[PDB]
Structure 1
């Protein structure tokens, strides 16, 4: 039932996650965060209790209200400063097309909550949301804006693609290799995701507002709720957390922190840096000889998974620059220099082998990988 979302169990997770994310931020940076960029997304195969929205509500310092009998969400209640041991953190939410289509009530809940936090009379150090929404509203009014229009526009926190549009708009740009620098990925990401969503209403073209929100963002955040997939076998992560981080870099001149969080065990959320998650998945899966031996029993399909892993690794380097030289070296050695893996791929799926070689050559070309051997360049080019 979409009216019962976020569930109390998704709330408990969102709250613990938000606390752990703030803490990780303070450990990394030595100061309270004031502005995160979150992605809310979904698959038919996800847990359904409303984790993303719960985390966003927790960050801003709002709690859902449930009907005790029915367990439906009836509204929200602002957590007062008396009940906060840290400041409210501003949240800019990028929603996927799936998320936008599936969960209009969640979007409306968050939109109303964050605007209500932005209207509180609280000190800037407790409430950066209100300070931003008041200042932007005031700048718009002083330009001649109708105050009501100005309050509407200053308070937008939910951005997505227009109706009938899916993904972040980067896949073709990366696959055709028709991007010069990361600024071109940021431009496509803004064109694609520049629509503001508010409670009840349809999407509104508001690219300038998205840019202003992203200019403030200090960390990019995305959550994973199961271990049946990872960030190097699905397009859900590079295009949202990856594309959002490219865009913040393009607007500010500094790459923000990216936190790829593990909500697979709801009682024990684990916050990780994207570099940590990348390395966990290379060790655990991509370069894991148990994983390689297993896909070597699935023929054409297995070889395609190897190739896809390299595609995603490249996509993360393209958007974020957070893929270390060691990862590219590791997959080169595991997939190309290991003659048993190389020969498996050449026999069962030579196109997948050619795609892997071509991707590693582009990684060299872009400065994502400097091969430990000079002969690796020629081998890869001769192979592709």
Structure 2
């Protein structure tokens, strides 16, 4: 504030901090609001470079996360030259964004994976790519940028970049923006030779032509829309399991050479659609439009692509609703009521027609020989499953950047915001208040609703409807510029009105942030060489501070989790998991549970899934005076009330990158448990560790190695790549690759040395009785991305176990106040019923056209992944998918015309699940699919 100023004006174009600290520290606890306030006034690009660079993976992980909270850009990832030059050149280029006139600025925008063929599908971006690019182009043009020949629409935009994309008359072909020669190539890219190990001498099959390298895209004045069809690539990850290493082909390198040394872009804009499978961009300022609900992958981009990650809202979430057979059943259950035998028999019949017999226990007994309760609980349990399907809050569509939701299409998002207690802000959820007004506990209703008690299942729905109508009253009254009258009109007149006040005062504030249009504003500020406001990810419902969007989003201080609320919520989930495991399998406790840790959900819940694993082993985090969680301790068996349970923990590469300090804590806890002087029947960790130590000839502590991940620099088991390329022969191949890639053991007694320990990995996995993951959210669910099944060891454990027994598979959901520990199959069915097979969902997607079909195949490809890793997909899922999308001749034609490439993917996927034995169906269906594959093959090729 003193030396960077002179009404005074800034005398600096860009700031590079070399301290490695927060802008505003102290003794202790960084002050980010006062740093943000200062950096906003100065309004310059703020870059930070840790002094560690100019010379303990835990120390690095803790340090690097702090400047990110200040909104810092990272100009860096034996001599000083490369580091000094890297920081200097990027600081200059960032500074040049101010010194350069607006009409001379050249903004490049690269698109990934168009047309959407094979390779990795990427992340759950929920992005209308070309629809968003078009809005960006017009926004730039209408602000003073030289955008020449701006097309008439988004459809016209894609047509300009992808000639005949819909394959009507000629085959789809990408617009060639430039043809650089081998001479020009090798001259401008010094690292060309290092790529010749896998691709040989340029050009080489990829991006040819045959003499020149092809730079796909199209120029529109000072704005260039480019296309990177393939990274170089996914394409059979089995080719890289040995001597061969990964390297992008010449075409991929040639693209960024064009932007750096020929078109000379001043700024590049990417979209967070392919996440961690994206890592040559150079010294040019690198912008990303990342989803607000994906902080974890946004920070990887910050640390691997020197990126500034501007956020966009995911589409306005809607209740999934009920449809077809599910609707008829809802109506059947609806009465009852006034009809109160024969109906219960038909309710059970339609429930079996909807295949709900595998979600709720439906005996072969007739209703005539049941009690009053036996009939009440049957219809009550079927009903609660229907309401779970109907009330699932998920996006049904794609988002266009700069196009915020209306007040109307934000009520559903708002009702769930109102359905969560918040001690500070100091308000209670609407349902709890409504429940309190009639002398009830909202969680007692939840617990009873889970048991299938009709009186409580109906009461839940009534309170839900009362909540789902009251919030809409506040929204409607906001539109024309009342919610208490709605509560009375719903039947709850004794609601604490004192507490109703700050609640709706909060909800109205949230409404403005949901509908705020700051997304394009963030891009401008970045391009103008200004300072973009930093904000937190990721889940708006659980944390409305993620709103509004258009900010440079970040993750959190890895020493701030788990919170006390997180560890308490974790015990509940664990107790629920164990209860469900004892029943239907015991009732003995499992001796070992295999879990996966994702960074994403731990950011959103402040360490819940992390805290679950601590509790399984009987350990607790110990915050210091400053509130930093950097210690851990065992809890006495008296407090645990059950045996310590052994764990096998699969940490994602991303989790390892962001939270290696937590991996350190976990490994400490597990080893403490194994050393505990406790009876073996009370300590399954020690029970196993002792046995393993003898058989391996090592010490107990070393035998207690349970915390694993990818090797440093690596991400995923590559199972997702193999599934997306259909490049594997049998399940043993996938599992072999899993054991090779995921068996790198973390050591809290030697943190820097993460060595492979496949022997320990297998011995630990052999003892697993259960498999466990936490659901991130409804938007990022089991079929929305491929990472879940990628880390899934379910079938692997079957082949490892001597008894060949398949472990029980569970998925925890804490995205609402009603925490559920579902089985894997139950969750897969929930995804199928609410997304792929749901008219409300697929029609919403298809209403965006070309990119809508891509979303369909994505959900279907990931479903196939679950068949390969766990076999958790019921046959009716594929059969119904084939019904609505392929047997329907009208829908089949609509799909093939909208998007030949994505339709081709749906066909082959259905063809594949049958070919491998996951889908049994009539030959008439297989013959039709086999033909449709040829019809679309010809259109494209």
User: Which band: TM-score by shorter chain?
Assistant: over 0.9
Give deviations 1:170-201, integer Å, cap 9, x for gaps: 13322333323221111010011011012223
Contact kept, 8 Å, 1:153 with 1:209, in 2: the verdict is no
Q: C-alpha displacement at 1:99, in angstroms? A: 0.4
Residue 717 of structure 2 is aligned to residue 176 of structure 1: no
C-alpha change, 1:115 and 1:86, in structure 2 (3 Å) is: same
Match of 1:294 in 2: 844
Q: 1:308 to 1:320 in 2, by over 3 A?
A: same
Alignment map for 1:23-172 (pairs within 5 Å): 23-30=579-586, 31-43=588-600, 46-47=603-604, 49-67=606-624, 69-141=625-697, 145=698, 150-172=699-721
Q: Check conservation: 2:878, 2:919, Cα contact below 8 A.
A: yes
For 1:218 and 1:285, the matched residues in 2 are separated by 30
Aligned equivalent of 1:323: 873
Q: Are the structure 2 counterparts of residues 152 and 130 from structure 1 closer, same or farther at C-alpha, using a change threshold of 3 Å?
A: closer
- 1:11 paired with 2:567, answer yes
Distance 1:45 1:286 in 2: 27
Match of 1:226 in 2: 777
Q: Distance between the aligned counterparts of 1:172 and 1:229, measured in 2?
A: 18
Please tell me whether the aligned partners of residues 220 and 258 of structure 1 are also in contact (alpha carbons under 8 angstroms): yes
Equivalent-residue separation in structure 1 for 2:602 and 2:694 (angstroms): 44
- Please give the alpha-carbon distance, in whole angstroms, between the structure 1 residues aligned to 2:601 and 2:631: 26
Conserved in 1, the CA contact under 8 Å of 2:811 and 2:823?
A: yes
3-state secondary structure, aligned to 1:271: strand
Alignment of 1:242-321 (within 5 A): 244-252=793-801, 253-265=804-816, 267-321=817-871
Cα offset for 1:151?
A: 3.9
For residues 279 and 106 of structure 1, what CA distance do their matches in structure 2 show? 33
Q: Return the offset for 1:275.
A: 0.7
1:90-135 deviation line (CA, Å, top 9, x unaligned) = 1110011100111011001111011001101111221010122222
Measure the CA separation in 2 of the matches of 1:9 and 1:224: 18
The whole-number CA distance in structure 1 between the counterparts of 2:603 and 2:621 is 21
Residue equivalent to 2:173: none
Counterpart contact for 1:13–1:269, Cα < 8 Å: no
With the length of structure 2 as denominator, give the TM-score of the two structures.
0.39
| C-alpha deviation, 1:45, in angstroms | 9.8
**Alpha-carbon displacement from aligned partner over 1:211-236 (angstroms, at most 9, x marks no partner):** 00110001110101322221111012
Contact 1:96 1:166 in 2 (8 A): yes
Q: Which residue of 2 aligns with 1:240?
A: 791
Match for residue 205 of structure 1? 756
Which of the pair has more CA radius of gyration?
2
Residue of structure 1 in register with 2:460 after alignment: none
State the Cα deviation string for residues 344-375 of structure 1 (Å, max 9, x = none): 2111111111111111111111121111x331
**Contact 1:306–1:335 (Cα < 8 Å) also in 2:** no
Any idea what the Cα deviations from partners look like across 1:269-290, whole Å, max 9, x if unmatched?
A: 2101111001111111111110
Distance apart, 1:74 and its partner CA: 4.2
Question: Are the equivalent residues in 1 in contact too, given 2:675–2:686 (CA < 8 A)?
Answer: yes
Report 1:189-200 matches (<5 A).
Answer: 189-199=738-748, 200=751
CA distance in 2, matches of 1:175, 1:217: 28
Alpha-carbon deviations, 1:16-48, whole Å to 9, x = none? 111111111011201211100000112399505
Which TM-score applies when normalising by structure 1? 0.92
Choose between structure 1 and 2: higher helix proportion.
Answer: 1
- Partner SS for 2:600: coil
Quote how far apart the aligned CAs of 1:331 are: 1.0
Q: Deviations over 1:51-90 (max 9, x none)?
A: 22101001111111223x5322242231111122222111
Report the counterpart of residue 905 of structure 2 in structure 1: 355
Secondary structure of the corresponding residue to residue 232 of structure 1: coil
2: distance between equivalents of 1:45 and 1:303?
31
CA distance in structure 2 between the aligned counterparts of 1:160 and 1:329, rounded to whole angstroms: 36
Query: Does the C-alpha gap of structure 1 residues 44 and 258 become closer, same or farther in structure 2, counting only changes over 3 Å?
Result: closer
Q: How many residues align?
A: 372
CA shift at 1:340, angstroms? 3.8
Which consecutive unaligned segments of at least 5 residues does structure 2 have? Answer: 1-556, 934-941
The 8 Å contact of residues 675 and 701 in structure 2, kept in 1 or not, is answered as: no
C-alpha contact 1:248 1:255 (8 A) present in aligned 2: yes
Cα distance in 1 for partners of 2:848, 2:779 equals: 18
Write the deviation string for residues 302-329 of structure 1: whole angstroms up to 9, x where unpaired: 1001111111111111111121111111
CA contact (8 A) 1:260 1:277 kept: yes
Give SS of 2:783's match.
Answer: coil
Q: Does 1:369 align with 2:926?
A: no
* 2: CA distance, partners of 1:82 / 1:95: 30
**1:268 offset after TM fit, Å?**
3.5
